[PDB]
Symmetry: D3
Subunit: 157 residues, 6 copies
């Protein structure tokens, strides 16, 4: 039984995220996408909206499921019988930040972290920049799943 | 079912390598350590020596095996019915270099790459620096497995 | 007719910015400095524009405008499709590469970068204001005009 | 004669900080740990608490003392007749940021800065990440000196 | 009359290089690609020049020359004082920043950088030759012309 | 008795190096510049020529001396009763490389390493790029001490 948790805000999920989901699900028996609820910074979409968008985008991934996440990530992972985190990286600076989190998580709970490199096409894509561009009328449709873009237009009106 | 190839020169294997082997073996059903040889440049250790040093320090990992090869890594991977590479990284610069290799490998063969962050204790450990230090009589005993240190001193004398 | 937009907050413009303006102006027929209305800084947009105008008088082919909304819209609505910006660090490059690739994707607008002059490697609007606030001498890092205005803003 | 100031928020002091204090004290005749306070943003610990935690874990360093301050660091340094700052770095990004600060400080006041590389064991340790992990109940006991860990748990409760 | 020199070994030219050539040509009146005679590669300087010429036919304001000696001399002896180059990584930026600052110091020649297209982030002449040598398909990373020539060089 | 060894090829010494020498000598009781002899890569200047150029450039630094260095650096340091290395850094990548060497040197011998950031004016200066530029007729006179530039012109004819 191999498996990993894929944590993030996914506010909203982008094609960069989806590519990582697919690639994780291709190699692990089970993937759990954890949608992290931050009571301090409530973004654009509610946690349930985010989960709904990820489920529509990952309909063809039967070994991937989506749940809301709260509290300490390594607790979330271990309570579900798993011992691994998986995440995508775009830049060296991403790696620096995530290496520090990864080493902390392994230190405090023995949970390991696996990274994959971004697909070239999505190296500049992020939820925050996509939202910003869309807010000022820019076309981010090629960067988001179809379901997401429609929902995004709805929020902006 | 799940499986990954862990590639390198391993000339010689270090504790940093072994940590990554152990962590990969804990997460994939099988791991193949691929000792990749350039047939036109010998290292310090012969291929048989490299493999023996790895085997002697991985005896407790039942789902790990060690094989040598040359040429395209993605051919080594695919001929074994696998589709994943696993590698450790120490720095953001390592990430930039390995990201380019991973994106090339996925492009030409559809093979994916998973990275793990170095254990903190081994952030400064490399085969090349260990050999250089040992060449001038520095004590690298704590950085190498027992199967390696004295063999190394033997080469140097 | 070649041209480029040089975007930033410029709060206030420093000698580092000015060096980039001069270097852009030397290579493009037309340069527009876009002062980004980002509505919480020290100077008003109009104050920033004036300070830039004062220190770029020797550059005949440069003008200064306030900017709001999508930068790529600002650029294209003025008939251009190049952005020019200075970089100090590889980290700056990473951040700016993402914006550059986004801007090219959504609008076909390209971005050209120049490396900082060695002398201005440590100069930023934020650090200059911070040091000046606690009484440090930043006169050698700002246009003579800007330096007087900064003193006034603090008193 | 020789002396340096080691500046920071130390909110709270970690083992990574203490390692740098010890290493600085071994190389300069005197070291002053400067607890720098922003009078408009409180941290987790009061200045007196911060200083007490540092003192309790530096009792074996006879040439180290601890003082608080605010405003320009170079004024703190020069008013004590010193001309050097000493700081630890974990990453190349830390270096880029601290290089800009060091060059500014030498420009405005002629004060120089000396950097040391983190101990490998503490590469992932920061006050902020330790507080964040502890807030959600993660075990950070091995990352903080005895003078700190339980005081921290006390704040969080 | 604006212009820039785009220097490199181009052994061989890739789609990553070509993208930069096209983007430079769109913003400067004149672009000169300088093929650096570095006298040990795969193609001769003349072969490299021809391959570049073949794939830049649609760019009226671009020409290709061999280059030797100081780049800043090459640039200034042709009446220009700008270099243009592409970057993939922050590490590229660090390396190139040092050359750029050196070149500005010794000769007053400026350097403009552009960010790689996302699609070509992993593309280099060296990696393309290496993969092709061991039998990998790099046809999507090279100009159609160049790709045929590379196959020939290996057989 | 504070002190440090400043190691390098110094082939030839540049104003970037000299700035670091001056700043080290301003803070340590004793500085020893170690001119590293590499039997594999013999550069432009002999070790004795390099030592001579450094001595002329550091004539006003009475607590700095210059010696040839061979073999393991931490042995060189410790045999002279010192326990510290000092070096200058220009970029984050410099820091990455040197952090690894620094951690190795502290691991194998307990010798510490202190870094300073380059002066802004010399951030692009290196011996190798200076030699290359000068070789093809470029003016590197503002980047080198006077004595060095004269000697450099001599070698190029
Ligand atoms: N966007 C994006 C992206 C991309 N374009 C390419 C590669 C990875 C990602 C990625 C970013 N994050 C963090 C953002 C968040 O937490 O919502 C992830 C979290 C988990 C898995 C993947 C990602
Ligand atoms: N040494 C080291 C090391 C470390 N200390 C920490 C983290 C990863 C590694 C590591 C380096 N390589 C390069 C190949 C080679 O060295 O021969 C790997 C290949 C596979 C798995 C791990 C590593
Ligand atoms: N300060 C500084 C600086 C420097 N010292 C050297 C090189 C470039 C710059 C630079 C920074 N920014 C962003 C800050 C802002 O948005 O105002 C620029 C925006 C446009 C052009 C140049 C810069
Ligand atoms: N934590 C940590 C740490 C570490 N684990 C390793 C290396 C240096 C440090 C370190 C961070 N800071 C920032 C200031 C602060 O945190 O309050 C310093 C200030 C002075 C000396 C050392 C450090
Ligand atoms: N390959 C590649 C590439 C890419 N895929 C994306 C962006 C830039 C480049 C690029 C690399 N170099 C240096 C290699 C050489 O000297 O031949 C350039 C020189 C000039 C212009 C562009 C490049
Ligand atoms: N050149 C240069 C330089 C600069 N411009 C600014 C800051 C530091 C240096 C510097 C480089 N190295 C390594 C090169 C060598 O070993 O010869 C040093 C070794 C010791 C002390 C300083 C340096």
């Amino acid at each position: 039984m191999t498996g990993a948790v894929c944590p993030g805000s996914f506010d909203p999920v982008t094609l960069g995220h989806l590519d990582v989901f697919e690639r994780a699900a291709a190699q692990f028996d089970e993937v759990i996408v954890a949608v992290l609820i931050n009571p301090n910074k409530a973004g654009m979409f509610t946690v349930d909206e985010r989960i709904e968008m990820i489920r529509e985008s990952t309909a063809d991934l039967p070994n991937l499921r989506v749940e809301s996440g709260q509290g300490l990530l390594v607790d979330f992972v271990r309570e579900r019988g798993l011992n691994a985190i998986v995440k995508g990286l775009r830049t060296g600076t991403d790696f620096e930040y995530e290496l520090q989190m990864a080493q902390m998580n392994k230190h405090i709970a023995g949970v390991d972290t696996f990274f994959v490199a971004t697909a070239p096409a999505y190296s500049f894509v992020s939820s925050s920049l996509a939202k910003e561009v869309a807010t000022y009328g820019g076309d981010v449709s090629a960067l988001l799943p179809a379901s997401v873009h429609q929902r995004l237009l709805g929020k902006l009106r």
